[PDB]
Specification:
Chain lengths: ~350, ~150, ~110, ~150, ~150, ~120
């Protein structure tokens, strides 16, 4: 309460975090339906840490509070608290979401993840591993059966043990290494080896343990090393195929397919004619050439990195023109990461 | 004969011990690496027509770098720490030229490079130019690699 | 907020930082005058750290400044004519108790 | 990638202890801030191939300023007092670049700057030019801020 | 803002003690008045990151004047006496710029100026130029006045 | 066998040779017909030392092994192991051969050289 024109000395100051957002990382944090200390507003928008503490001022110890407070302290821009019941409708209404972050949530985010993937909304889910210690005599098939077999998701087992004693969901550890990667390296680079601060893995994980959980459904460990403290260690999705392994090459095409339709939605209701088809394929060639020359596409020439194709005997027929359709086909090569490094050693004494 | 190497494509990789990730930073104007051997001339009594050069000590040059004032990288945050004397960490630098495809044709591979000088460009009211800052490192050893030596 | 010299140091910083704050008082609320005020406060707080008044072997753990539009303020705070600046400090502790120990260290 | 910073928009704020109000003065030609670390080379006995650089002492440059002969500001009245030796007051200087909107993208923030040199331009009968005077300060410390470091 | 001062209109007034009348002489090329304060850098033991500049002694520049070889004025007759060592008289010089009307906008006001150097122009057979002679004075103090300081 | 995403430390490392080939030297190494430790494939193509040791992993002491291992350690690009019986047809089919190298071979490479 400011009355006089002077200088006010208040001493109840709290922390603050500067926004260092990425445009390709706008997540959805799902909070549980049977949660008592959330506002009855089912969908709520948080652009920064200052708007989050005017609605949640006391520091809670729940799954949604420690996910968001770990989000905003690593940059992070606008984000959504959506109830578990309205996750398939908040993606369908708000047009901006790129990530579905299950912040300590099971079996209801999963069935609403597989709804919006079948509807085609170009999202990427970040699920959770078991909160309990996986034994080692447990089998990777019986442990990984809760999770969908779609290439739009990753699991991330080891939970967090935040420095204030609270427990961080491991989807929030994974989403805070996506913000720091989508600035400094881009969406085509893996979210793995970037280190997230202020968190600690609850369990020590060996690499004999991760070898069982890598092929098949890809658990995607969260491991700490000397030096690089608590990175996420793994970048594979929930299917082991030649195309849609590797979280980079799925999230690259999600960014390509969304930045192309944002460019081509300004060409809808144009006359379906041959001058309009040339304006489509030159708006995609101009997008993909800039994306090639910043390292996102694999190819040492523009003919090996992408192609755009549209015609009247190429991609669509005259009986299909008359329905208002405009079929463009676009193929483009992505860069696969390195995952294994073999150090082959020889020596011989005094030689 | 194979075509000579042009000088307008180059990558630079840094590896500090403060910083856990190796980072790659684009520069404008890498200056050039010299390596002198520092001989000395001796004069003998009865010999007036030949010279005598005696090898002593290899002297390495300095790595002068130029780039524009852009967002804060892990290297301009690191010169800020060393020139404020908060750290004296040095890095292993790898510089390499690229051919038409992507391939490294020559590599220079500096060792224990220490940030020693920051130099800011001029602020002028009629100028029409990017603010370029000049960075300078002193390294201990140098080891050139590659197929185009 | 025990230790008399902690209450008297941080109010000696109140007395000077509010002396140069009201120098920048009836200025615009534009972003240049926010950074004109950080640059003067950052300079002064760094000199007191190098004079021995604050704890910390690096500047990042001695003090902090955070003025800005969505760091401390908001657009509703700007239209009411406010300019909010945050200072964090790290202070020194007294040597009230000396806990001597002795170790024999046999060595043959 | 974000666009680099051009060098033709800049504000300078001064704060003396003689003068109760902080004042802001437009210049033409701020020169440029250097910061050298002053290493020295040591030669070891048995080592002939590597170098050894030892860090000593950070040297700061000088703030050279240029503006036209205009009405008497609180800074040309202050150099007049220091160069007449009536005061030895020094100021905390804040220099900052501005982007397209108004926003400070980099800030340089000098400490205890002391006016040391005045230099007047030439008076020439055929000249067609503004009389520019050159001002020069020696500061103690320097601390660069901002998002574009 | 008010318009800056251009540098092609200027009067110079001299006052010697030999000469009873103060005289006003038109020049071509008044050089420019400097004023340096001559600091010195001290290095402290435990301090490696800041500098320390200590003020000593104000140094004034020199008044270099140029005009053509014209009829004998009371100032070229006075340099002739001083450089023949017949007198060692010095003068109080007043230099001032003029605005569009007639008004003095800045004034420089030198004290005890001593004629120290005469320099004649070149005699060349193909030249097409006025014979310019260069005059130079060393003064003791300097005191700038006016509204455009 | 790579399972986990880490770093693998294998210690059965062997030698390796970088290819520094010439385009005008593509040879034909003729191995003997009555040789026991050659693969029944009569014509086989070897671009480098790595493709040669995936088919001949143990170091033999024969005329064809020590000819090729001395070939690849001095640069050397693609080359052919051709049986003595098919030397007149491997030159006629593969369009690329510039040298016929009798790697310890008599009287049958000679009569198929003159063909």
């Amino acid at each position: 309460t400011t009355t006089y024109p002077g200088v006010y000395l208040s001493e109840d100051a709290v922390s603050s975090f500067s926004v260092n957002s990425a445009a390709t990382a706008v997540p959805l944090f799902a909070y549980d339906s049977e949660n008592t200390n959330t506002i009855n507003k089912p969908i709520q928008v948080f652009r920064n840490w200052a708007e989050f503490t005017v609605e949640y001022p006391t520091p809670l110890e729940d799954a949604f509070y420690t996910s968001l407070s770990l989000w905003f302290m690593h940059g992070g821009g606008k984000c959504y608290l959506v109830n578990e019941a309205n996750i398939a409708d908040a993606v369908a209404q708000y047009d901006d979401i790129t990530l579905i972050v299950a912040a300590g949530t099971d079996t209801t985010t999963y069935t609403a993840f597989t709804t919006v993937v079948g509807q085609g909304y170009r999202i990427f889910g970040l699920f959770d591993g078991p909160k309990e210690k996986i034994a080692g005599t447990a089998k990777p098939d019986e442990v990984m059966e809760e999770y969908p077999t779609s290439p739009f998701g990753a699991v991330f087992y080891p939970w967090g043990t935040l420095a204030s004693g609270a427990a961080v969901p491991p989807s929030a550890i994974a989403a805070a290494s996506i913000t720091q990667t989508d600035r400094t390296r881009g969406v085509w680079k893996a979210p793995a080896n970037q280190a997230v601060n202020g968190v600690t893995p609850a369990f020590a994980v060996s690499d004999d343990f991760q070898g069982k959980y890598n092929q098949g459904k890809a658990l995607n460990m969260i491991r700490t090393f000397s030096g690089q403290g608590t990175v996420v260690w793994g970048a594979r999705t929930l299917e082991d195929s030649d195309n849609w392994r590797y979280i980079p090459v799925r999230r690259l095409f999600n960014a390509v397919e969304r930045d192309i339709q944002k460019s081509l939605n300004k060409l809808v209701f144009e006359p379906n004619s041959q001058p309009t088809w040339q304006r489509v394929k030159a708006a995609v060639d101009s997008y993909l050439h800039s994306l090639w020359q910043q390292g996102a596409l694999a190819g040492n020439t523009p003919a090996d990195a992408w192609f755009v194709q549209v015609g009247k005997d190429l991609t669509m027929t005259q009986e299909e023109i008359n329905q208002g359709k405009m079929i463009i086909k676009i193929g483009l090569a992505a860069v696969r990461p390195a995952e294994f490094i073999i150090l082959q050693f020889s020596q011989d004494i005094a030689q | 004969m194979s075509t000579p190497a042009v000088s307008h494509r180059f990558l630079v990789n840094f590896l500090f011990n403060n910083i856990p990730n190796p980072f790659d930073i684009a520069f404008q104007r890498i200056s050039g690496l010299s390596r002198t051997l520092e001989v000395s001339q001796h004069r003998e009594g009865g010999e007036n027509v030949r010279n005598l050069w005696l090898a002593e000590q290899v002297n390495h040059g300095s790595l002068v770098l130029e780039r524009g004032v852009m967002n804060a990288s892990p290297l301009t945050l690191q010169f800020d720490r060393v020139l404020r004397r908060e750290s004296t960490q040095w890095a292993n630098v790898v510089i390499m030229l690229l051919n038409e495809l992507s391939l490294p044709v020559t590599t220079w591979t500096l060792s224990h490079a220490l940030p020693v000088r920051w130099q800011m460009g001029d602020l002028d009211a009629g100028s029409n130019q990017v603010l370029i800052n000049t960075l300078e490192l002193r390294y201990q050893d140098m080891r050139m690699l590659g197929v185009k030596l | 907020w025990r230790y008399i010299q902690i209450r008297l140091l941080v109010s000696s910083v109140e007395h000077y930082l509010s002396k140069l704050a009201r120098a920048y008082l009836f200025e615009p609320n534009t972003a240049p005058t926010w950074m004109k005020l950080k640059g003067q406060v950052w300079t002064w707080l760094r000199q007191q750290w190098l004079a021995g008044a604050f704890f910390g072997t690096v500047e990042d753990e001695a003090f902090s400044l955070s003025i800005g539009l969505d760091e401390t303020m908001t657009e509703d705070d700007i239209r009411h004519g406010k300019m909010i600046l945050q200072v964090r400090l790290a202070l020194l502790a007294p040597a009230e108790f000396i806990a001597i120990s002795l170790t024999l260290d046999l060595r043959d």
